[PDB]
Structure formats: C-alpha cells, structure tokens
C-alpha cells in the first residue's frame, strides 16, 4: 500500500523511525507519549522498549494487518484500543503488565517509584476496569514516598494489580487482608502502614 510507505517516510529522521519520530507521529493522531493509548500503540506495533527504533517492515506490516491506509484510519484504530483499555479487563491487564518492560531501563532491573506512580495515576483512575476509592491510591503513594521506597520491581508491579483487584477499599483491607499470603513483603508493610 503506497500510503503506508508514504506515512512512514513522512515521520522519519535521518533514515530512522526513532523515538523523536514516534513522538511527532502520535501527537498528530492527537495524543502524548505518556498516555495509556501510546502503551496500546506501542504494544500493537510490537515495541520492546520505547526508545528503540521501529523497522519499516514492522510499521508497514502492522498497519496493513488492521486495515488502515490513512492517518485518519490509524487515529481511528488507537481510539478503539484506548476504549478497549477502559472496557476489557483482559486487555487492561495485558497492557498493564506490558507497560513495565517498556517503562523499564535496560540498564536496570527495577523502575524508579517516580516513574511508576505516574503510570499508576492513569491506570487506576476511578473510570477504569479496576475500580477503587481514590483515597486508597493516594494511600499507596503516600506510603511509597514516606517509607522511602525509591524503586519498584516487576514482581511487585504485576502483583499490585492482583492486589487492588481483590481490595478496592482501605476498609476491606483492614477487614480481611491476610499477611500470611503471597502478597510481596512490600504490600505487608503497606498493610501495617494502615492506621
């Protein structure tokens, strides 16, 4: 499809579709790099880590798989993904987990709490599939910044989802949270932090 290879050729810098070209591309579609939709887009084109170059054959291949040929088609596609992120708990989970490695520095095994909280603010919004009292999410952040926890591991990360899914209220936690369970030690410290 000539349009596809024409679009890809539009946002290229020094013969590459690098990070600065992805930024200029999603913004034309109406988004920002920090948005959950970009996570959706990244995941579709099959990124492994955000700053890593996107191969032509990869771009031309995914876009054609969907049935897009215009920017207007691409924009239409992401909007569906972003909506799926709000209605399908499977996709939400699948993307939540996919996010860590993307955000994650290859020169590291953990992400900094700073960067994690940013994405948590978006992921756990009242509107989304994992509904919870905004007071709890505020709690977790308060605890993270006070006990001086500066980094978060993939395990903790993938486990906090399962956690908030079982417990949507600071109430329900104090009620039956069972500290003799697989919840990572970090969660227990949080649990002990409540009072």
């Amino acid at each position: 499809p000539k349009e596809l290879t024409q679009v890809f050729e539009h946002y290229i810098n020094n013969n590459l579709f690098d990070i600065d070209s992805l930024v200029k591309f999603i913004e034309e579609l109406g988004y920002n790099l920090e948005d959950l939709a970009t996570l959706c887009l990244a995941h579709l084109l099959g990124y492994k880590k955000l700053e890593e170059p996107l191969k032509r054959e990869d771009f031309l291949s995914t876009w054609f798989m969907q049935g897009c040929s215009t920017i207007s088609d691409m924009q239409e596609c992401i909007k569906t993904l972003d909506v799926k992120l709000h209605e399908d708990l499977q996709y939400f989970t699948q993307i939540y987990n996919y996010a860590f490695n993307l955000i994650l520095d290859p020169n590291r095994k953990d992400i900094d709490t700073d960067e994690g909280i940013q994405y948590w603010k978006l992921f756990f919004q009242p509107e989304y599939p994992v509904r919870m009292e905004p007071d709890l999410l505020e709690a977790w952040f308060r605890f993270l910044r006070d006990e001086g926890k500066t980094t978060i591991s993939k395990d903790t990360w993938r486990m906090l989802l399962l956690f908030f899914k079982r417990y949507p209220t600071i109430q329900k936690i104090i009620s039956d949270y069972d500290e003799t369970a697989a919840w990572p030690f970090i969660i227990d410290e949080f649990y002990e932090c409540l009072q």
Partner: protein, 70 residues
C-alpha cells in the same frame, strides 16, 4: 541480618521440589526451618522476595506459587 539460612533453605527445598504452592513452601520451609530458632512467617516471606529478585524463583501465573529457575 541473618535471614540467610532461610534463603539457603528455600532453594534447597525449591531445587529438589521444583514447584510448590506458596503456603506449602512457606510452612514446609518453616518445618525444617526452625531448628536453629523460630522464624516468623514474615521472615520466610522476605526470603522468597530476596530469591525472586536474585533470579532463583519465578512466581506462577496465578500469583500463589513459586517455580525454581535454572
């Protein structure tokens, strides 16, 4: 500062067993875990985290099981 016997203990059990439920190991480890002294289920848990982070254990999909990596 010496929860180290504990890590030593888990991998010993996890190497031989190769896959367990959280509760099983958290208690099975405690079983042959005391003997040098009593250890709270808090402590054995932090070991798992330590090993999870070192590369020894990989948490199962369900979220409540551990698997011994290479």
């Amino acid at each position: 500062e010496r929860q180290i016997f504990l890590e030593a203990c888990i991998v010993r059990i996890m190497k031989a067993k190769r896959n367990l439920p959280h509760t099983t190991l958290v208690n099975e480890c405690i079983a042959q875990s005391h003997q040098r002294f009593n250890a709270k289920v808090s402590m054995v848990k932090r070991a798992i985290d330590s090993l999870i982070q070192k590369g020894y254990l990989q948490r199962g999909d369900d979220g409540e099981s551990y698997a011994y990596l290479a």
